[PDB]
Design a binder for this molecule. Structure first.
Ligand SMILES: OC[C@H]1O[C@@H](O[C@H]2[C@H](O)[C@@H](O)[C@H](O)O[C@@H]2CO)[C@H](O)[C@@H](O)[C@@H]1O
Length: 224
């Protein structure tokens, strides 16, 4: 690895991307740790991985190490035409409580901190160990060439929309996240004309299990 980010909130940025050893829930663990590795920045993308083991509090996320596309504040979702992204990943085992997911926060306050927002949009590519997203099942949705189970609910005052695979995982994925926002704007009254983009990320939410290793073989993201 080019960089090993094993400290709490160990951080790298470059090429308009960033990487964080984002162990935001680790104090709920009874044992374990996690490191995030920058493996490469080849071909306009990022190659990275994370290794971990956690015990305790099986409904509590311990971490969400992520790669993020850096974005400028003050861009309304309605004024973003496209958020094209692809990811290729593997997990070395699936007998763990964890997901793989895109995470996007938006907020009416363009200076809202990066830990949250008014709204959260997640696109889950894996659902291991019997975990649930925030909220309850809403409806099925056709986007990005797939069918999704949409779940909705609240994390504090933040409304969370999570799009889940009905079965299996999706280890190679590409999409335009604006398709997901446009669907929410049409059918859920999502106020895209007053919501600003805060973060644009992919990573893995880790609850319990391991030793486990997530490998992001390639990540690319753009927006226009
Ligand atoms: O806490 C935020 C985190 O929640 C995760 O869902 C939890 C949920 O908080 C809890 O109420 C329920 O009983 O357990 C689930 C896990 O199975 C959610 O999966 C994450 O996306 C979210 O970041």
């Amino acid at each position: 690895q080019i960089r090993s980010l094993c400290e709490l909130y160990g951080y790298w940025s470059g090429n308009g991307y960033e990487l964080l050893n984002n162990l935001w829930g680790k104090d709920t663990a009874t044992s374990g740790w996690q490191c995030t590795y920058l493996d490469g920045t080849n071909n306009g993308g990022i190659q990275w991985s994370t290794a971990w083991e956690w015990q305790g509090a099986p409904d509590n996320v311990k971490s969400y190490p992520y790669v993020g596309k850096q974005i400028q504040r003050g861009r309304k979702i309605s004024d973003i035409n496209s958020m094209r992204t692809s990811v290729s990943w593997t997990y070395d085992r699936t007998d763990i409580r964890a997901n793989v997911a895109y995470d996007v926060f938006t907020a009416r306050d363009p200076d809202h901190p990066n830990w949250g927002g008014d709204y959260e949009l997640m696109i889950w590519l894996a659902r291991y160990g019997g975990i649930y997203p925030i909220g309850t099942f809403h409806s099925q949705v056709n986007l990005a060439g797939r069918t999704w189970d949409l779940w909705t609910g609240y994390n504090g005052n933040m409304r969370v929309y999570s799009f889940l695979p009905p079965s299996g995982d999706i280890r190679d994925f590409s999409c335009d996240i604006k398709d997901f926002f446009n669907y929410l704007e049409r059918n859920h009254g999502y106020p895209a004309r007053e919501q600003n983009l805060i973060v644009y990320q992919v990573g893995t939410e880790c609850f319990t299990g391991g030793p486990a290793r997530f490998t992001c073989r390639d990540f690319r993201a753009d927006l226009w």
